[PDB]
Design an enzyme around this catalytic site. Sequence first.
Site, PDB file in Angstrom:
ATOM      1  N   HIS A  73      -8.209   1.039  -0.272  1.00 25.10           N
ATOM      2  CA  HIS A  73      -8.435   0.497   1.075  1.00 25.10           C
ATOM      3  C   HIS A  73      -9.587   1.172   1.821  1.00 25.10           C
ATOM      4  CE1 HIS A  73      -6.075  -1.861   4.379  1.00 25.10           C
ATOM      5  NE2 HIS A  73      -7.378  -1.965   4.558  1.00 25.10           N
ATOM      6  N   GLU A 115       0.846  -1.181   0.000  1.00 26.89           N
ATOM      7  CA  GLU A 115       0.000   0.000   0.000  1.00 26.89           C
ATOM      8  C   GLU A 115       0.882   1.231   0.000  1.00 26.89           C
ATOM      9  OE1 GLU A 115      -3.868  -2.060   1.135  1.00 26.89           O
ATOM     10  OE2 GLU A 115      -3.658  -0.333   2.489  1.00 26.89           O
TER      11      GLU A 115
END
Lengths: 211, 527, 106, 527
Positions: B278, B260
């Site tokens: 997310h 991420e």
Amino acid sequence: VVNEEVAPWLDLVRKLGVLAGVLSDELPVSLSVQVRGELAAEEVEVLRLSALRGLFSAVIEDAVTFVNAPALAAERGVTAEICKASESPNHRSVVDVRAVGADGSVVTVSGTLYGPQLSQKIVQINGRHFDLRAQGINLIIHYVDRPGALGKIGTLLGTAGVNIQAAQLSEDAEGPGATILLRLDQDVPDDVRTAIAAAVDAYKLEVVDLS
Amino acid sequence: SLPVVLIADKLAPSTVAALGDQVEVRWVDGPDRDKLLAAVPEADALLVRSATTVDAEVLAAAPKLKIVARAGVGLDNVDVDAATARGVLVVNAPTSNIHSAAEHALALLLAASRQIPAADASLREHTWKRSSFSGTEIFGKTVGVVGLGRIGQLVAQRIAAFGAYVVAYDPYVSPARAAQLGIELLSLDDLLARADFISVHLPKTPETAGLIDKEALAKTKPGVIIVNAARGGLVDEAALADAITGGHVRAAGLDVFATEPCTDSPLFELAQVVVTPHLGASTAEAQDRAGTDVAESVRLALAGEFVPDAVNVGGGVVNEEVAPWLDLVRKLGVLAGVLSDELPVSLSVQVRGELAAEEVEVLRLSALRGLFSAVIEDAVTFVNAPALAAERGVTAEICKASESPNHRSVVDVRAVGADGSVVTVSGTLYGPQLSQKIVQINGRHFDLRAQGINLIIHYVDRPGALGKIGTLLGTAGVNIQAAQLSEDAEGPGATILLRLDQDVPDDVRTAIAAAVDAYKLEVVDLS
Amino acid sequence: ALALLLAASRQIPAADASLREHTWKRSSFSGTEIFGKTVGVVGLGRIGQLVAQRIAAFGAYVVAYDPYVSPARAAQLGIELLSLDDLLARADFISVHLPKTPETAG
Amino acid sequence: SLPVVLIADKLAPSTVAALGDQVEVRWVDGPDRDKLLAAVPEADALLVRSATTVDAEVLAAAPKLKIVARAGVGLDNVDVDAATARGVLVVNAPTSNIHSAAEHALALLLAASRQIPAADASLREHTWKRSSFSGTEIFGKTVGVVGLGRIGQLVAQRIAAFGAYVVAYDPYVSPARAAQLGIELLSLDDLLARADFISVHLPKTPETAGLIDKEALAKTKPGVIIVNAARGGLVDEAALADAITGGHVRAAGLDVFATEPCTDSPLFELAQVVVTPHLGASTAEAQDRAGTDVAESVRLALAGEFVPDAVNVGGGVVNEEVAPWLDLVRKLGVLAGVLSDELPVSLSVQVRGELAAEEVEVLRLSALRGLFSAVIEDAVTFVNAPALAAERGVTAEICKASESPNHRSVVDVRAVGADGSVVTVSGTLYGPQLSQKIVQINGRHFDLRAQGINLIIHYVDRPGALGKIGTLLGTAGVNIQAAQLSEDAEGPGATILLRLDQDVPDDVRTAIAAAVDAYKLEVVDLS
């Protein structure tokens, strides 16, 4: 009277004696039997005789009797000692037989008994821990830990038709070495012991009957 | 003198009203180091979200701190080891996001099958490309759920109302539980073959990471749509991209990324892959639930009550006598799980000897944590037993006995199967260092460090087996630290356990199996 | 209808777009949770009936306005029938549908 | 105006102190009819032992009576049907005797193996016949427990400490539960073959009565010692006597008799059979536990709380809409149990349609009661779910759904097996008389009175099967009231269910099985 609690230990401590002896390279000058734990509350003098008797059968033709042994030990310059401590760090009860050679080198072997059958178990050789039945032909090897080591031991035994009933191998805490114990279905020919011993770089290699 | 509850991240008083009026709640700007460290000294409790980091420095400055609570599910911003070390209870909000996240999985399944973002974009550009789009109907289709914990269960339930048949793959759910759910349990291979839709719902553990790789993606149905709203890289990102382009998987929805802060995935260049940064928990309702959950947890904590959402051990919650037994028992659960053919329905934890005089309920939880660690995330030491039973179908109990046959104290972990068979594994601590020892497996006794990579083999071809096994391991360059092996009391079988210095390659495992003729060959990391 | 309710609730299009222009704007999004909310279905022809059953499975309570639908059938779809006014007052989400009587639809 | 608690039998105030000080406890001589009937009119609660009979007359004279509590386990002296009819909660003390009774079983096992009463008698007569006696050691021996409910479990546990291996026969305990107990589950045949000691622990039901007959007694080990402290005639008294005399069973202990007040059994003429007049519960501690149990039950009852030891339904405890569903659901449990290969681990009770709007938790208990009725005694309608789960290993849940596919309301009882397979059975009530109908079995639909003797057959040989089945039943003189049969959707199988006017003899069952080539042949009484 040997006490009911004590009687089952006789044959075990004899075998610890046999073990301490075969495992000593020179005849020991001292033998020390340490009784720790629950057993320590009984009258275990007779276990000192047992150990000695074990020590000496492993060395002298025509095995020793019970009143025979103390005088025989004295006659060969071996002194015996017995300790009793309530405190056992791990097992409820354990016996250590310690043999010291003239050159100051030490061998300790320990045994217990537990379970409904009161099975006899070897539980220490020189600070390595185990739980193996104190019976049958047992091969003991102290060797140099290299890749291939355990395999070579196994390959050679099997190649010789010798079957392994049980085996346990511990690694040294602070060494390059390892120590294994194997209960075998039959003796290992000399030629093959030499072979196992060269195949690994054995400090020690002994075979002992624990019947 | 009312106990102080310090809120270091952005949680509103109303979110937190479950703390009584028996406390003094204060607020601080947690991201701001100097402020946090100035305020934390008087804190009894510290609540936090994700912006604030509760590292050693913070803990060392907080001398009477009793709970650190994270309103959320991640524990990334809390050094749990350090809090345990200092006696600080850590707590989170483990079921606070399950609905918002299920819903997001569904959102993504539907967005991907109906090509929403691209359609919306076409109207955004002021054109009418109706003719170009082509969705996929869900009704009547087969949907594979990979991992059947709370969220996968919620997703299964939602998707079933769309008239889809649901199958699942999860070796850590019992069959009875899956059948209560009206879900059919499958091998991953069988799920892959049958599923028109796949939704992943695994936690990230090394057992899980990259589960669905090129090889898996190649076994799926042509036309499959895959969703991952769960974790990081559960679906290999490059394999996905390939199969999308290549045609084989029709579409996909991703909410999480291998690494991420992610702004550069090639997947972002494929129209048929719906992606979101997310989100999943990104919801007023989920963020409120987090806050009010954690607030109740802090309440119980201060009230000297039991904290079910505990993530760790801290306080009197464990005697000094019992403490060192937690980790060993964890390892007995791992091992009992590994030696079991399939998931046990229950664990019977038997405490014998001196230890039996202690208060040992936490050990029952340790056994469970170990049994389930393939689906538990590292930081967490405690599990919610009542929750795990209801979600997954498995319980634990503890029995005591004054007598221990051999050692002064021993713990046995009995793993029981639905069919009534039992796998038993025991351990002790002994000595100055209280080193952990595995001492029995299924009626066989020995003394082996509970540590390291262990190879366990059940096999049927006996003569020379030691030779074969050692020689293959050694040819592979694998050192053997310790070993225990014996011939089965009844029958033609034998069992060896070896502690190794590294893992064992797959071809060598296959070689060993073939050579001693194994029926069971396992390798568990007993760290 | 579900796809759109969910895409609008989670801002999927705008969230997918931000990624496509290589930014990470996680902090700009903030969805609405359905669980436990009240959903109003306006019109209960078949698609609306189906929508309501699908929405029930997200754990939402469903109200609907449709004066010509069999009240028994509404109960079996787990739907509380209301006047339009009452639906509008109570609805967190609304989905509008062809009703049972084709265009008295307002 | 404090509620009145009338004690009609011999229970001391101290026994009953669990009733608050929020009540007015009075005492009456219950055996004395005129006194009882004079005092009962003002009673809110009525406690009783066994001397007093709570029949219709008593109930009709007690207009505001809310609980009848029996300090004990028997319900013989309470007309429970009449109390249900009048809305009166009946309660007993179902685990109040388990220890005193286990201990008595053990007492009898030991007295019989060591010939105590006869020895004691020989010294009583002033002679020394040491040489004549010869006991039987328990250590190392195999002990068969027949029936593994609370008491058999207590007995197993006590006996195990004597170093005996324990086996059990109980088709109503799950394997996982027996294995948690460390008990091996056996066919009755296998138990019989292996046991050196047998202790019976069955309830009396027609499924149980005379279980151990001549044929069973002939399969036991020579030298076996048998104990029955459980029930009435579980061991055929004459077969026992024969086998004792004949030598085959060495000794026995009996505490209960086929027909009690029993002063004339031939067993009383055999020295090697130890006998006692239904002691077992005869103990200050057991009689106190009864009293204090039932006292708490009455407390909860009056406090408008849930009474777990309820034996029946009374009060608002069930809506008028739901009431008629209890009995039908009971029958769905019986049937789900009968169609299951082995005991299910759980029952999933699904309530669909209009009924789902009702409060239907009691139905989950009805399903359980039915499932377990081979080991439940008639009077009891309610079961303690939490107790049954812990003792036997089986749970229940309830799920609702607004939609019912066909009927306005339907209940489905899903019986789930440990292995994940499911047996589904559904029912409705409909019409003026609200008659009970079985409407589905395993995806097959029909409409059959939930009543009477039903023959169910799963079989593999299809052509002419109706002919064969009907013709054998008819040649046996068995009328067929109704029937449903269909060929399995997938595979070579077929299934028929028939309602008959009497039971089906064993030879005819065997004939039918052979003729249609059955794998399943069952006959359940759906009254």
